């Protein structure tokens, strides 16, 4: 049994943050402790109470069954930082192994039954995963400038003022807050119903409920394949420009070897006078000075930030004559797939693909190819081939709804032509609430 | 009162359809249709000229106008000086400009407090317009229609289509149909009734 | 699937010269497909057949 078919466990910090504050509000007595002793009964009784199916681990080996009971039940077990997390369990039959993961999101709601606190979704991790980790000073700025676009001039917001001192400015990070009330000793009380409001137990995000709704709806939109229009890794490969679909990445033949690029390879040695920038080829040390004749290498670039304007060029140079396939895995450009009739303009030259700063997300533009009309039957034959280098490592054109609206020979669909997807015109009812859903498929 | 909403007439969604047409193709048989149906399947097929190559579902600046930053153009939203590297100077066409195009926009959707008002709907009745389009229409279609792959069926020359449309809105599910449906609410009041379009 | 008729546009032709001994430093290799003609222009095929 593979992927999402074992035991799940998450780091204590994750558990604290997101899942723990919720536990305090329902009242149900805090979790139980995965201990070496505790039998399948203890785990059962604990989840029978908190009724959330989470067990906290802080006692030697888990051993004996129960651990098995855990396979039987989600009961994600939370535990301090990962490592030796197999030396913890007693997989008395070798299966556990500190290296088998399907690191997954587990949208919180699939843990709590009283979903009146749970909100938003796994869609956010998708998004924050992209945000470049910001600093407190950084956020003051992101916020200060959003509020600015909103038109609500913000000043002394979050700061302080007190004359005599300066106007020292507190921070603004905050993640999730709970307007918990503090015992006199200045240290957070555990939210109690008969003493503090009922509008404080669990504060959404300080976002009015109606407002919260278009937000799940929005992030839903943001985290959508058809709006992920900022791709990554280009491949650079020599080849004959023949293929309509732009979302076509030339696969790599049988021969080619996988070499992870690094500075260690390309030394600078002497061979026949001249200092040819030899490449060494890890598999079997064999410096090959002259670009031409290297040995069918598949170059993978991850770095690309420490190339000398020449070692890199030579490598690109070798791409040409040697069919080396170099994959620049770190670039983030934006495609275009713009029709043949007015083909190209912004000309990326090979020198630039290679030396561009890590930031700059340059626009590229692949050909539409499919809508080009057959060349004549008397067109003067073309002598020399067209060469194409840049390829897109992942499937571009997602924005594509339909494409190739034109008859082939007056009945057959041209190849590569798309036709719109059913779901994009299945306009069905509304639920027994408001959410508009598709049409049944004759099964409710 | 408190302006917690804006009643607009004919709403503008987020994603749209944008088509690029090689401009040298053009079936020459000319298809002319009922004057009325030329008004339903009016824009739809017109936008959908015979010879458009790649069609994309942009985000549409019409709604995400530069008035909020998100200066679209490239498929990427691309906000601007939102989350810069404090202490320097942006970085002409940076990459994070975009993580951020994504942010203000989620934020815009975050707050689209606008209400809708039926606007200048029209009603054609059978005979006026075609049979095909007619099932699609349930009476009083909004006067300022939109555009939509189906409804373009048996009105478009692209011969293969009527294999992916005239046999698409043919399966069990996917029952197309613009117009004015029955929405459970139907006769609920307010300060006007509510219709469902 | 129809003969041109119109006048489509093609990828610019960079001319490769390849002289007895030429020196090979392709460092500007433009990425968008291009057609490389070895002989200076010369396509010579002009004798219309009415």
């Amino acid at each position: 049994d593979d992927l999402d078919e074992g035991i799940r466990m998450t780091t204590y910090d994750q558990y604290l943050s997101h899942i723990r504050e919720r536990l305090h509000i329902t009242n149900v007595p805090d979790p139980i402790y995965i201990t070496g002793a505790s039998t399948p009964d203890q785990i059962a009784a604990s989840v029978q109470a908190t009724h959330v199916a989470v067990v906290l681990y802080q006692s030697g080996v888990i051993n004996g069954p129960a651990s098995t009971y855990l396979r039987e039940n989600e009961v994600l077990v939370v535990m301090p930082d990962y490592y030796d997390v197999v030396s913890r369990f007693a997989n008395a039959n070798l299966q556990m192994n500190n290296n088998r993961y399907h690191e997954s999101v587990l949208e919180i709601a699939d843990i709590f039954d009283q979903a009146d606190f749970i909100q938003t979704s796994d869609a956010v991790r998708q998004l924050r995963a992209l945000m470049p980790t910001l600093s407190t000073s950084q956020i003051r700025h992101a916020i200060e400038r959003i509020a600015q676009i909103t038109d609500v001039d913000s000043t002394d917001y979050g700061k302080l003022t007190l004359r005599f001192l300066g106007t020292l400015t507190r921070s603004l990070k905050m993640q999730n807050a709970q307007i918990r009330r503090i015992r006199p000793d200045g240290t957070v009380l555990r939210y109690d119903d008969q003493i503090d409001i009922e509008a404080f137990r669990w504060s959404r995000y300080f976002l009015d409920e109606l407002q919260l709704r278009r937000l799940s709806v929005g992030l839903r939109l943001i985290t959508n394949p058809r709006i992920a229009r900022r791709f990554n890794g280009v491949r650079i490969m020599y080849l004959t420009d023949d293929d309509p679909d732009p979302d076509f990445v030339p696969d790599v033949p049988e021969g080619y070897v996988a070499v992870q690029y690094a500075h260690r390879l390309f030394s600078s040695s002497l061979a026949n006078k001249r200092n040819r920038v030899t490449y060494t080829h890890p598999p079997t040390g064999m410096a090959y000075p002259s670009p031409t004749g290297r040995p069918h290498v598949h170059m993978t670039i991850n770095e690309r930030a420490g190339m000398s304007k020449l070692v890199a060029d030579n490598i690109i140079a070798s791409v040409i004559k040697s069919n080396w396939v170099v994959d620049i895995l770190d670039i983030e450009y934006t495609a275009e797939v713009m029709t043949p009739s007015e083909g190209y303009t912004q000309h990326v030259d090979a020198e630039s693909i290679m030396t561009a700063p890590k930031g700059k997300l340059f626009h590229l533009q692949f050909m539409d190819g499919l809508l080009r009309p057959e060349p004549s039957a008397f067109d003067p034959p073309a002598s020399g081939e067209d060469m194409r280098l840049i390829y897109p490592l992942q499937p571009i054109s997602v924005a594509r709804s339909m494409r190739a609206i034109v008859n082939h020979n007056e009945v057959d669909r041209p190849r590569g032509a798309v036709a719109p997807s059913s779901y994009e015109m299945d306009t069905g009812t509304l639920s027994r609430n408001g959410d508009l859903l598709y049409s049944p498929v004759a099964n409710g | 009162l408190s302006d917690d909403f804006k009643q607009i007439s004919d709403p503008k969604g987020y994603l749209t359809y944008s088509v690029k047409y090689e401009d040298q193709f053009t079936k020459k048989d000319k298809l002319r249709a009922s004057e009325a149906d030329d008004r339903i399947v009016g824009p739809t097929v017109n936008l959908f000229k015979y010879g458009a190559a790649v069609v994309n579902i942009d985000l549409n600046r019409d709604f995400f106008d530069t008035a909020t930053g998100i200066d679209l153009t490239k498929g990427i939203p691309l906000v601007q000086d939102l989350l810069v590297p404090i202490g320097v100077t942006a970085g002409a066409e940076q990459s994070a400009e975009y993580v951020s195009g994504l942010l203000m926009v989620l934020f815009k959707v975050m707050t689209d407090n606008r209400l809708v008002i039926v606007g200048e709907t029209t009603t054609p009745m059978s005979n006026t317009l075609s049979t095909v389009v007619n099932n699609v229409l349930r009476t009083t279609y909004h006067n300022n229609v939109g555009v939509n792959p189906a409804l373009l069926r048996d009105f478009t020359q692209v011969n293969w289509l009527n294999r992916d449309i005239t046999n698409m809105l043919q399966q069990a599910g996917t029952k197309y149909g613009l117009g004015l449906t029955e929405t459970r609410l139907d006769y609920v009041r307010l300060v006007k009734t509510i219709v469902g379009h | 699937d129809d003969v041109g008729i119109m006048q489509q546009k093609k990828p610019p032709t960079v001319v490769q010269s390849r002289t007895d001994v030429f020196n090979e430093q392709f460092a500007n290799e433009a990425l968008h497909p291009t057609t490389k003609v070895i002989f200076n222009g010369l396509d010579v095929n002009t004798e219309v057949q009415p």
């Binding site: - | 607009i8 749209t16 944008s18 690029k20 090689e22 040298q24 936008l47 009734t193 | -």
Partner: peptide, 26 residues
């Protein structure tokens, strides 16, 4: 002529509700 390229985006009109002076139901 020389086979041109062309693009068109899908229009957009959202006038802000034209307040009318006529009921339409008794």
């Amino acid at each position: 002529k020389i086979a041109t390229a062309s693009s068109a985006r899908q229009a957009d009109v959202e006038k802000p509700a034209d307040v009318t002076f006529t009921i339409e139901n008794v």
